[PDB]
Design a binder for this molecule. Structure first.
Ligand SMILES: Nc1nc2c(ncn2[C@@H]2O[C@H](COP(=O)(O)OP(=O)(O)NP(=O)(O)O)[C@@H](O)[C@H]2O)c(=O)[nH]1
Ligand SMILES: [Ca+2]
Ligand SMILES: [Mg+2]
Ligand SMILES: [Mg+2]
Length: 166
């Protein structure tokens, strides 16, 4: 049974925890409790393969930026999340990508760019703007709503499929 070490990263409040909890526990967290560092594990079948997802849900609140180097070393794939109603969170993605990129000493780290909260109408990050960022990384862009579950399984499973291309 393959184990996949996924790490969810991004700015505070973008929905990292709500996405992970929707995937693992199938409900929507309406309240905002800032995360330090939590882990989840679940056995799932992906493309006929039983595997174990080990998901690290990280802090976006800039206090715990010191713990970033630790988890960027352990993780095999990174879900890089911003919120489509938060332009600053989109601009912050670089800081996360470069950090992963620097820490891993690799321009070839399994990653997926996630535009979350696509159920909200106050969009300030257009899909094409995020597609361009993902293209320069050579990674997929996927929009999600942790609230409606739109795209949630697709985002995490796509990251597993990125790890599998090595
Ligand atoms: N409408 C909507 N709200 C969402 C969505 N995802 C998260 N939220 C809301 O946004 C707030 C923050 O979500 P949360 O998952 O805690 O964010 P986070 O990125 O884990 N924060 P932190 O980095 O501090 O741990 C919560 O009120 C949550 O309900 C989404 O897809 N749609
Ligand atoms: Ca709820
Ligand atoms: Mg959180
Ligand atoms: Mg604009």
């Amino acid at each position: 049974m393959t184990e996949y070490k996924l790490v969810v990263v991004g700015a505070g409040g973008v929905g990292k925890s709500a996405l992970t909890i929707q995937l693992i526990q199938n409900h929507f967290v309406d309240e905002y409790d800032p995360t330090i560092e939590d882990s989840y594990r679940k056995q799932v079948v992906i493309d006929g393969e039983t595997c174990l997802l080990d998901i690290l849900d990280t802090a976006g609140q800039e206090e715990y930026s010191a713990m970033r180097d630790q988890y960027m070393r352990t993780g095999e794939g990174f879900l890089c999340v911003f919120a489509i109603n938060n332009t600053k969170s989109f601009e912050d993605i670089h800081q996360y990508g470069e950090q992963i990129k620097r820490v891993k000493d690799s321009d070839d780290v399994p990653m997926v760019l996630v535009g979350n909260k696509c159920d909200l109408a106050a969009r300030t990050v257009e899909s094409r703007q995020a597609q361009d960022l993902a293209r320069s990384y050579g990674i997929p862009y996927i929009e999600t709503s942790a609230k409606t579950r739109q795209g949630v399984e697709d985002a995490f499973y796509t990251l597993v499929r990125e790890i599998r291309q090595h």
